[PDB]
Design a protein around this ligand. Structure first.
Ligand SMILES: Clc1c(CNc2nccc(Nc3cc(C4CC4)[nH]n3)n2)ccc2nc[nH]c12
Length: 291
């Protein structure tokens, strides 16, 4: 009776019907922890969409599925992935999204070296989105190269909102252990009450990704790496001699063990380093089909 409960609940927030009646040429392109992703054609228009499919019976924490729909619906932005519709289909939650041709950022950071014009342009894109989200007390909790999508012209959008949490006056902090281990904030790992600050930490770790190609302690097992993140100091860049004083100083405002002294999105938007940010055109050279 618990599963039927969630179905009905989810049924009340999604759009009615079955999208299979108006979609064609389903083509699987990926698989996350929460489910798989297909591209498909909207028959009536020939436009392409992306369809994320998530089994209700295959979730670690069902109640998180509302984030999949609710977040994208309430926050539109140049830097946030567009959602067109959501449906309940069988025992699956389908989300129909904008299709970002350029794929995830992770494919870039592992196969190439981004320059600081490119790195700055990414950070600006994320911080602009995080600023709006943080403003309404929403924590993303899964900031990393995986959660960043790109277009053909190098526009950048924040994705994967399934791990979101809301804070407010009656709920000032969150306490649950959420996110991807290496990108997690020290206060969150330590199981202390946390807020939006943890997102700024993760971004820092994601900046390490863009420079070193991987996060700190990435060769270690996840549980052991988490322990290291907690006890140790802010992690180092293995290629620090390759980053500018500008980038370093900026990063030093991200990777702060005390969330109180850790910078905020709104503050970071005004940082000198983000002035280096080039146009979307500067990101184009880095994508798989181009390089
Ligand atoms: Cl499976 C998976 C993908 C899908 N793989 C993929 N490959 C090439 C292009 C492309 N573009 C997209 C994607 C989307 C909406 C998210 C579904 N719209 N356009 N997506 C992406 C990031 C992930 N991070 C973790 N798992 C991820």
């Amino acid at each position: 009776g618990s599963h039927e409960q969630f179905r009905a609940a989810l049924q009340l927030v999604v759009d009615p019907g079955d999208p299979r009646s108006y979609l064609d040429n389903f083509i699987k392109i990926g698989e996350g922890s929460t489910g798989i992703v297909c591209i498909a054609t909207v028959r009536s228009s020939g436009k392409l969409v992306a369809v994320k499919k998530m089994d209700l019976r295959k979730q670690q924490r069902r109640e998180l599925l509302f984030n999949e729909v609710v977040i994208m619906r309430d926050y539109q932005h140049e830097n946030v992935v567009e959602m067109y519709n959501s449906y309940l289909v069988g025992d699956e939650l389908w989300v129909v999204m904008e299709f970002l041709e350029g794929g995830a950022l992770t494919d870039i950071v592992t196969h190439t070296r981004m320059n600081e014009e490119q790195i700055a342009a990414v950070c600006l894109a994320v911080l602009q989105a995080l600023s709006v989200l943080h403003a309404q007390g929403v924590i993303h909790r899964d900031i990393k190269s995986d959660s960043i999508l790109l277009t053909h012209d190098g526009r950048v959008k924040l994705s994967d909102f399934g791990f979101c949490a809301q804070v407010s006056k009656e709920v000032p902090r969150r306490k649950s252990l959420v996110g991807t281990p290496y990108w997690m904030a020290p206060e969150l790992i330590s199981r202390l009450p946390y807020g939006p600050e943890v997102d700024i930490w993760s971004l820092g770790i994601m900046v390490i990704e863009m420079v070193d190609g991987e996060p700190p302690y990435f060769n270690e097992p996840p549980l052991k790496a988490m322990k290291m993140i907690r006890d140790n100091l802010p992690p180092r860049l293995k290629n620090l001699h390759k980053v500018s004083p500008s980038l370093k100083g900026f990063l030093d405002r991200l990777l702060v063990r005390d969330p109180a002294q850790r910078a905020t999105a709104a503050e970071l938007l005004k940082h000198p380093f983000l002035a280096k940010a080039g146009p979307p055109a500067s990101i184009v050279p880095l994508m798989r089909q181009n390089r």
